[PDB]
Each structure stands twice: as C-alpha cells, then as structure tokens.
Design a protein around this ligand. Sequence first.
Ligand SMILES: Nc1ncnc2c1ncn2[C@@H]1O[C@H](COP(=O)(O)OP(=O)(O)O)[C@@H](O)[C@H]1O
Ligand code: ALF
Ligand SMILES: [Mg+2]
Length: 984
Amino acid sequence: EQRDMNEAEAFDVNAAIHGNWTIENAKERLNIYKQTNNIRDDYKYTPVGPEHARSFLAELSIYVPALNRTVTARESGSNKKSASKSCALSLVRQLFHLNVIEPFSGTLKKKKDEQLKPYPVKLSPNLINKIDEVIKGLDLPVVNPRNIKIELDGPPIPLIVSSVIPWAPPQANWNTWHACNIDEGLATTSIDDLSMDYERSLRDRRQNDNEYRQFLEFREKLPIAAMRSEILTAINDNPVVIIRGNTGCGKTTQIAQYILDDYICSGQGGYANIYVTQPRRISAISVAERVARERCEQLGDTVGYSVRFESVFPRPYGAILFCTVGVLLRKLEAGLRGVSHIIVDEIHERDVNSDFLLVILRDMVDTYPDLHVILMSATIDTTKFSKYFGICPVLEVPGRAFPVQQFFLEDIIQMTDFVPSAESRRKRKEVEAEINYNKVCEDKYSQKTRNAMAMLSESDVSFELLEALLMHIKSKNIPGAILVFLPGWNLIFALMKFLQNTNIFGDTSQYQILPCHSQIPRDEQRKVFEPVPEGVTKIILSTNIAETSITIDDIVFVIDICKARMKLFTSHNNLTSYATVWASKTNLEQRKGRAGRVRPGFCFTLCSRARFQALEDNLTPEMFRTPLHEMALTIKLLRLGSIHHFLSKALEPPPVDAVIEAEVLLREMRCLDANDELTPLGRLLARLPIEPRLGKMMVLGAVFGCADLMAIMASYSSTFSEVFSLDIGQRRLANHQKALSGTKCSDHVAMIVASQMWRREKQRGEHMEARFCDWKGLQMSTMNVIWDAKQQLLDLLQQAGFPEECMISHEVDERIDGDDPVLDVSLALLCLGLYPNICVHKEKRKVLTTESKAALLHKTSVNCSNLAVTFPYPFFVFGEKIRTRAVSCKQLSMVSPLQVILFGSRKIDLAANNIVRVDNWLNFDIEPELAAKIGALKPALEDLITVACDNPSDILRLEEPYAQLVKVVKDLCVKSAGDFGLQR
RNA sequence: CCUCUUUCUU
Ligand SMILES: Nc1ncnc2c1ncn2[C@@H]1O[C@H](COP(=O)(O)OP(=O)(O)O)[C@@H](O)[C@H]1O
Ligand code: ALF
Ligand SMILES: [Mg+2]
C-alpha cells in the first residue's frame, strides 16, 4: 500500500554532486539551519488534481542575510511528506552550493538492498575472440579480475577504467534574414535607391489604393494610434522601451508598422529591419498574415514569418519578420547584422526561451547603442522589467478597443440556476486542510447559489456546469465564437465527446466543435481562424496556445476553467509528472483579452471570487522547474560566457543546484571539455533541436549506418504526442497495434513499423493515409511531426557534413523471429539514448527501476498486459518515468542484457560469488574477464563518437581499428549474442 | 470528466 510509491519518490540519484545531501537527512539539516538562524517559515502546500490523483507542491522560501538573496524551492510529491522532503532536499542542495552550509560528513542508515538473482549470458568463442582482436587493435586497456578476487562481501571492485552577439548597421548586398551576402544579381542596387523606391511605392499606395486607404483609416482608430507619436519618439531616443497596453490595443500589429513607416517616409526605408518575436507558432503566423493583409500585399514582400517547419522570408530591406523566440535564438548563431529594431511581445510568459532572449538583448543593447529593443506586453511588472533594463521608459497605452464583461463562478451559478447532480456527491460519498474557496462567498448571492457553490468542487471540472453555461450562452442569443480554455488533451477531447453525445450540441448544422492543441494536425490548427457557415457557432476547446497574441475575428465568449497544465520534473529521482494547477491572474486576463477585439465580448471565469483573489499574479517561471542543459549548450554555442554568470544575469536567476546539475550532465556526456569549452560534438548537438543524449545517439547511429532509424526514434522520444490512440473504454492497446511490434516487443519498433506503412499510404494518397491511420489506430499528427523532425535532423546532419550514404531508410520486418542486424543495433543505441531508464520485469505489469524501485508498465505500451505473460528478456529501456498514483514506465523496448551492458550502463563492478554488478542493482552471471573485455569497449565507442564529430565527412571511411570496433559492436548487438547454450 | 498527449526549438 503506497510503500513502493514512498520508496520510489524517496529514491535519490545525484546526491554525490550535491555534497552528499539526500532526502533522508535533508529535512533534519534544514531544521537545524532554521533553528540556528531563527527562521520560522513553514512549508506551503498546494493540492493537485481531483481527490483521487492528489499530489502536492511544497514551497519554502528562506532568506539568507549573508548573501542577501531569498532562496526558494518548489517540489512535488504524491503526498505532503514526500513533497516536503523533496523541497527540503532541493533547498539544502541550494544552500550547500551557495556555500551557506557544509557538505555531509556522516553516513546514511541501512540500505535494504535485496538484490535480484543474477542473469546468465554466454558468448560464442569466435565472438569472444573477435572482441579480443578489436581490443588489441584499438589498444584498449583491460582490467584483469584474477588479481583482484578480494570481494569478500565488501565494496565491489570496478572492472572499467565572454563575447557579445555580432551586430552592425544595415549594409548593401546583405540579406539580414538569411545572414548571408547576397552576392547575387539585380538586387545589388544602392541602399539609398532601395529606400527611395520604398518611399515612392508607399506614397503611391497611400495616394491611390482604396483598400490601403481603408486599412490606414481603421489603423488610425486603434488606441495605440493615439500614443503613436510618443511611442515613436521614445523608440527613437531610448534604446530599450517598454510598451504596456491592454490586450488588443495594437502593440504587435502596429508598433513595427509605425517604425517601418517612419523610417521609409524619412527616406531611410532600406535602414529598417524589424524582428518581432511571438511565443507561439500559431500567433506568429497569424500576426504576420494580419500585418501583411493590412499592408495590402502578400506574405514575402514586406512581412514574413519564420517558425518550425514553416518560413516565408521577406525582402532583405525595409521589412518585418515575425518569428518565435526559439527561431530567433537559433538565428542568433549567425549574428544580427542589419537588424535595426528587435521587438519582443508577451514578455509576461516568463518562459525559458523568453528569459534567455531578454538577457541576450540586454547585453546587446548595452554594447550597441543604435540597436533598438522594444518589449510589449499587457500584463507585466513594468517596475521590475525597467529595473532589470537599467531604468527604461515605460509607455502606458490607455483605453481599450472594446469592453469585456467578466463573470465568476457564483455569478454563473446565479444566472444559469445551476445545481450539481446527485451522482457527483455519490462518487465522493464513499470517501469524504480545509482551504476550499467554493464555500467562501458574499451575502449578496442567494442561499441556493451558495449551496451549489459549496456542493461543487475546485479541483474537478464539471461537464454539467460547462454544458449549462453553454446552454445559457445559447439562450442569450448572441452571435460569436466560444473559446473554452482547458488544461490538456484529455479534458479537451472528453468535453468534445460529451458535447457531441448531446443532441443540442452534436448537430453540425448548429455547432462545430474544434480542438486547439499543439499536437493536432497543423492544417486543423488553422481551422480555428477560418470562418464557419451562417447558423453555425464555432466552439474552440483550446490549450494555452490561444491564450495570447491571437485574434479570432468572431470570438465573443471566452469560458475559462482557470487551470494551467504544467510539466513538473523532480531531478533527484528523475520523475516527470504533469499537474493541472490553478492559473494565475496574468493568464486569466490574457485569456479574457481574447474577446473584445473586433467587437464587445464576454468572459466567463469558472472559479470563485475568493479563489480569484487567492490566485497568484504570474505563474512560476519555467526556469525554476526545468532542466538547463539545453540553454547551457546554447550559451556555449553563442559564446556568451560562463553558464553561472549568464544565469546570474537572468531576470530571476535559476536554482544553483539545477545549474550545477545541467553543467555536470553536459560534462559527463562530453558536450564540454575540462575547460568548460564547447567540443565539436557539443556544438553539433547544440545545433540539433533534440536532447543532447538523443543527439549523441544520432551521431552514433550515423557512424553505424542506422541514422534513419536513430532519427525516427529520437524524434519519437522528443515529443509528447502519442503514436497509438485508445478508444473509449480502451484500457490497453488493441491486438492489431500490439502486433505492429511483432515479436520484438518494442514501442519503438512498433513506431518504426507504423511509420513505414504510413509513409507508403501517404505516398499513395491523403485519403488512403487517413483510412490507414484510422484502420491501424494511429495519429496522423504524431506520424507527421515525427517525420518532419526526423527529416530536419537528417538535413541538419547533412549540413554538419555526414555523408548521405549513412542515412538510407532500412525497412524493418517486425515479424522476423530471430536476429535483425540494423534493428538490433538501433535498439541497442536506444539504451545510450535513453539512459538511465532501464527496468527489469518481475511479473505482469510489475517492473523494477534502478535500485530495485517498483514501477508499472504504462497502459499504452505494447508490453503491458493483464495476463501473467513472460518476455524473451526481462530487461526493458523506456523513454520517460512518469509519476502517477504509482510510478510508470512509458515507451518501452525490450533489450538484451548485452545491449544493456554495452550502452545502458556507466559503471561495471565485480561483486561476491563471481557476479558482476552494473548500476549497483543489475546482476549478471558471466565471466568477469568477459565483463571487463566488453566494458573496455565503451571508451573506444566514445572515441568513435569524438572522431565522427571531428570529421563528419569521412565516417563511412574509418580506420581499420574503428571499423573493427563498429563490426564487433554490431555483432554484440545481435539479439542471441549472449544466448550461447542457454535455453532462455 | 475514475489523467496516454502544457509549449518551443533558422
Ligand atoms: N487576424 C485578425 N483579424 C481581424 N482583426 C485583427 C486580427 N489581428 C488583429 N486584429 C485587430 O487588431 C487589434 C488588436 O491588435 P493586436 O495585434 O492584437 O494588439 P496587441 O498585440 O496589443 O493585442 C484588434 O482590434 C483587432 O480588430
Ligand atoms: F498581444 Al495581445 F492580447 F496582448 F494579442
Ligand atoms: Mg497580437
């Protein structure tokens, strides 16, 4: 009873790099520190999810007078005790790394190992001989175990051995967007001549074009147009300008146009290249479309957009590019020469990329004075941001386009006469710290309203209440599209089916319910902007993509559930969990601003007024909770200095323990050298839009000739979309989808096979592809995004220099009962690309993660079954470990013990009774000399990655020792390599 | 609605 959960959460990995501080002593050390320093602040707890899937966030902030910095922590857990232990561990690690407290000198109490039985593996004599030959050819040192047989129950014996981003004023024959010398004819004219041509063309358009006249007349009626003159003056004078105006006032649409028009009418038209960064792909594309439309032209002339897998570049001079923050971050590697203005929208999101860009822009403004940076947002602490930018003007745009009327939960209940159903309490009648805000209300509201308020729940979303609100919206008889904000896919599509069952909402002739998710098909993502036939009301159930920056021309109603879905990550146990938490006031009012832009609207907030007053202003920055190795790589790539200095200069500096963990991770994976400089491998991985470990397996697979399979699998493991779709009541995968893995019993193999057939059906035709995906229970969006990311990875690998002759698409036959060389080597590199997610199967769904911690097989895995089935091998490598009511393993792929030892392993130790211990929990019964011989190949393989990254062009023509190493690694990677003489 | 899928990565 949840004891396995308790141990799995209390399990710790990275205590070694944090001064040997663990959960088992962290609370005691924190308590002693608080007693010594007279700090009496207690933990703060936040319930998560409905009453069954209850988790907690533990928050504790401690102020140190010595360092004059408040050191905060925010950690999650299945219960209050676990959450508080994780919080105390992170806080103690932070205090240790700030040199406030000391490293641990004591020792823990008991381990309770209970090791599992050893696993037998035998190699063929010729296989051992070729391993020895490869070792001798590669001069690999070996560890003879015959001289160290002293493992008498004691410790096991190991058996293995400051620059600023470039900027310059506009220049002739230079493409700002591509960052390349045009050096191409007839555009080699003078920049002054281009400016004069722009001025003449805009004058002619303003004098003749009736559509342009009408659009300028509309633009002159926006609230930002009133302050246009002061905005232009402040932009021209000050280097950094903060523009704070209400949502829809016209910031993104109008500021860049104002700057460009001023420059062009001044005769300097070719001296204005403006970058506008949006936080969402949909927002960037839509705003670029709108600006180009009201400029009475087409995309690519003066307005362009640039997002992932989509770019319509503008003319090289006198133009605006509407990109995402990540696109600009990637573009910064080539510099920002010829960029006159950089305009950043919605700086309130506090995302990791936005904070990164803010730091970069601050240094760039400090260095170059002619570069102008504009930060526009509707909901920001202007004082905090101006203090960050060394005191800058804040221009407050007043008024608003149209009014928006906001109602709360009590108002909604009063207006719709809502009453919760009896079965709602019946489900909780079997179950039955009271900080509930649904029981806090004013005396103006009716007694029945208060009773319904108390009867409702805060962490539960009421579909009946949503349906009643939608019925009342229908009753008021007002045209307009309804935007419903929901935390995630599950709730969005559950509400979709719920509404489609009802006759009132299931009829397409009256309603058209559209999803709005980042993982729905990209053409369907545009279906939320196109209009609908008369007599049909558009209902958009959306995530936070629609929250900001976008304008649907017929949005009149915005229903808000007020919950934000966040991806938690507890680093000390590598547990990743998703939590539906309460949204902030910033998010609430940004979502409210979706209406009242083209015409007056309404906002329906499904939370209590007391709950709204209890809401935080801005959500916790993603810096405080995300890993930092990606930005560590990016800082190294852009040559921005030290990681510690760069994140100290951040708006809110991230936790020092997280920074240290990212640095240690990137050092161990060898993306940096001893001097913390970027290695060629690190640079190649930095240019890749995947996790550095997946990029390392990318390079390795390219060396081994399976780059196509490595690409498809790394793309699959890099996305949160799901390959297999479960129907209503589908607790497990269906037989046809389980068959796609054949006898390989691998989610990755099932992915590859499904993509292989889906590619053929896509070539045959779109309708046939849709029929195939429906037949096989796949996701079109998942397949297409996996293909797009894998193609991007392959193209980037080509741009690096790797030959095309290492990326041939090798077809996979999942029905092969036996050995498949390419597939086996790919599944083996999976262990390196997913370390340390290795689990051993006990029985049914019961598996053990590292240190023999309990876990369950995910319901959507091919290896999950209710029957007590056995597997050809008890070892699996999974993608991510998910924290739920239990601990689950997701995206599993059965691997052989040889593959585990070769790739999913860092330390090899010889234990007592001639058993080798790997990862301190996996037992194998082999020859210790053979274990040392196999483990000696890991440094050789690392050197192979190094030489491949040094010279990507000649990886397919390697030296003789390295070719021998590749061949012997493939031979070891075959499935039955270690099954010599074993019944298995 | 008794949770497979917040967002972003020239
Ligand atoms: N795609 C669009 N369709 C119709 N009108 C739009 C569109 N985008 C913007 N607008 C108009 O522009 C105004 C909002 O400008 P916007 O760029 O949203 O400013 P901000 O970025 O400050 O919210 C609204 O009044 C709206 O009428
Ligand atoms: F940029 Al907004 F509402 F603030 F579209
Ligand atoms: Mg906008």
